[PDB]
Amino acid sequence: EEGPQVKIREASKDNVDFILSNVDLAMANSLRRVMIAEIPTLAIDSVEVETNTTVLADEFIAHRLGLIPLQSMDIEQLEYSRDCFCEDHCDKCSVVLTLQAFGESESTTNVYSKDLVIVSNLMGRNIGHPIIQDKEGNGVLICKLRKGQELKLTCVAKKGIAKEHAKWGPAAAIEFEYDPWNKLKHTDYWYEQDSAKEWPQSKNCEYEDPPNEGDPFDYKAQADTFYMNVESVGSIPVDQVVVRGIDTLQKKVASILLALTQM
Amino acid sequence: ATLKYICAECSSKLSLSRTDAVRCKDCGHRILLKARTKRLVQFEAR
Amino acid sequence: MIVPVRCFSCGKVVGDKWESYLNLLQEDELDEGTALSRLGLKRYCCRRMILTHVDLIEKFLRYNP
Amino acid sequence: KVFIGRLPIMLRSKNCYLSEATESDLYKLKECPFDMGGYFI
Ligand SMILES: [Zn+2]
Ligand SMILES: [Zn+2]
Ligand SMILES: [Zn+2]
Numbered sequence: 183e184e185g186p187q188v189k190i191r192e193a194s195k196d197n198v199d200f201i202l203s204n205v206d207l208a209m210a211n212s213l214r215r216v217m218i219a220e221i222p223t224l225a226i227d228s229v230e231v232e233t234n235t236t237v238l239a240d241e242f243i244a245h246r247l248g249l250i251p252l253q254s255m256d257i258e259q260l261e262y263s264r265d266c267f268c269e270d271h272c273d274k275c276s277v278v279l280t281l282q283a284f285g286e287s288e289s290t291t292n293v294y295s296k297d298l299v300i301v302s303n304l305m306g307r308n309i310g311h312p313i314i315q316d317k318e319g320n321g322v323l324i325c326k327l328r329k330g331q332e333l334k335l336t337c338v339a340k341k342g343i344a345k346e347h348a349k350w351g352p353a354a355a356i357e358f359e360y361d362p363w364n365k366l367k368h369t370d371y372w373y374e375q376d377s378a379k380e381w382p383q384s385k386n387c388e389y390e391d392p393p394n395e396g397d398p399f400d401y402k403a404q405a406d407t408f409y410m411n412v413e414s415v416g417s418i419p420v421d422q423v424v425v426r427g428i429d430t431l432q433k434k435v436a437s438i439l440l441a442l443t444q445m
Numbered sequence: 446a447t448l449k450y451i452c453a454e455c456s457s458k459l460s461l462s463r464t465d466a467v468r469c470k471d472c473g474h475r476i477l478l479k480a481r482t483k484r485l486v487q488f489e490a491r
Numbered sequence: 492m493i494v495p496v497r498c499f500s501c502g503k504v505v506g507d508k509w510e511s512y513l514n515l516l517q518e519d520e521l522d523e524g525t526a527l528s529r530l531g532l533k534r535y536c537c538r539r540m541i542l543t544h545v546d547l548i549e550k551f552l553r554y555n556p
Numbered sequence: 557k558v559f560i561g562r563l564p565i566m567l568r569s570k571n572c573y574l575s576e577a578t579e580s581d582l583y584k585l586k587e588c589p590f591d592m593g594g595y596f597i
Contacts, residue, residue: 225490226490227489227490227491228487228488228489228490229487229488229490230485230486230487230488231485231486231488232485234481237492237548237551237552237554238492238493238548240486240488241488242492244488244489244490245490245491246493246495246496246506247490248490248491249496249497249506250496251504290549290552294507295507313504314507315504315507316507316508316511317511318510318511320507320510321507322496322504322506322507323493323494323506323507323509323510325493326493326548326552327552328552337490347491348497348502349490349491349497351502353502354501354502354503354504355501355502355503355534413503415497415502415503415504416504453556454556456556550589553583554583554586555583555584555586556586
C-alpha cells in the first residue's frame with residue numbers, strides 16, 4: 183500500500199519479529215521510543231494497607247503490586263483519572279482490587295497475583311484482570327506468609343504511561359537493527375587483527391546482500407529497512423503494542439496541527 | 446474490642462495506663478509494642 | 492528479599508518464575524544456565540535477575556514475631 | 557558462697573546461652589543465626 187513496509191518473520195503471543203522497510207530511521211526510532219514510553223495502560227497506583235503482619239514493609243509490597251501486569255485490552259475505554267469529572271476515583275476512570283491472605287497452613291503461604299480480586303464494576307470491558315502466563319496459573323509472586331501472618335490491602339488501578347513510571351510500560355525489550363552489513367559505515371569497528379573475524383556476524387546478515395569487494399563506497403545509500411522485534415509484557419497483545427504505538431505517535435503529530443489551528 | 450499495646454513475645458494484646466506497672470499477663474516480659482493505628486495508610490505504588 | 496516483579500533493565504516479567512527455576516534445579520536436576528534458558532530468559536540482563544537473587548524471606552519467615 | 561561483682565559476657569563464649577543454641581533455638585531467641593558474636597552488650 184505504498185510507504186512503510188511490514189514483513190513479519192515470526193509472530194506469537196509474546197513477540198513480533200518483523201522487518202520495517204521503506205521508511206526513515208527517525209520514524210523507525212520514534213516508533214521504537216513511543217512503544218517504550220507512551221502507550222496507555224492500567225496499573226496499581228494506590229494501595230490501602232489495612233493489615234500487614236508480613237515480613238515485608240508496606241511500600242515494599244505496594245511497589246511490587248504496581249509492577250503486576252494488568253489486563254489493558256480496552257484501556258482506551260477508561261478515562262484518565264486526572265480527566266475524569268469525579269472526585270478522586272470511580273468506575274469511569276479506575277479499577278479497584280483487593281488482596282486478603284492469611285497464614286493458615288503450617289507451610290509457607292504464597293500470595294500470588296491470582297489472589298487479587300476486582301471489587302469495581304468492569305462494565306464489560308477487558309480490563310484490570312491480573313495477567314498470568316506461568317504454567318501454574320499463579321502469576322507473579324507478590325509475597326509470602328508464615329502461619330499467623332496476615333495481609334489485607336486495597337489497590338486502585340489507574341491508566342498511565344511509562345514516562346510517568348516504568349510500571350505503566352506495555353513493552354519489555356525492543357530489538358532494533360539496521361544495515362547488518364556495515365555498508366553505510368555508520369560505525370567504525372574496533373579490532374586487534376581482523377575486523378570481520380573478531381566481530382560476530384548478525385542474524386540479519388542472511389536477510390541481506392553482502393557488499394562487493396570492488397564497489398566504491400555508496401555515499402548516497404541511506405538508512406532504510408530496519409530489523410525489529412517487539413516483546414509484550416502481557417498487559418496488551420503483542421501486535422497491539424506496535425499498532426497502538428503507531429497510533430499514539432500519530433496522535434501527537436496531530437495534536438500539533440491542532441495547535442497551529444487554535445494558534 | 447481495641448488493642449492498644451501488644452506484647453513482644455507472647456503477642457498477647459495488652460492495655461493499661463499508669464501505676465499498672467510495665468509488664469504483661471503470664472509472661473513477665475517488660476517490652477510491649479504500640480500496635481498499628483486504625484487510620485488506614487495510603488501508598489503511592491511507585 | 493523476594494523475586495523482583497520485573498527485570499530492572501527491560502521490565503520483562505520475571506517475578507513469576509522463581510519456583511519454576513527452583514524445581515528445574517532440584518526435581519529436573521538441570522544446571523543454572525540450561526534452567527534460565529528454558530524459562531525464556533535469554534538476555535543477560537534478565538538472566539542475572541534470577542541467577543543472582545537471594546531469597547532472604549525464607550530466613551525472615553523463620554522468626555516468630 | 558558469697559557474691560562478688562558482675563562480669564559482662566562475650567556473646568557466643570562458653571558462658572553464653574547462644575553458644576549451644578541450634579539454628580532453630582537462635583531464631584526463637586530473635587537472634588540472627590549469622591551473628592558471629594565476639595562482643596559485649
Ligand atoms: Zn473517576
Ligand atoms: Zn506477655
Ligand atoms: Zn532484562
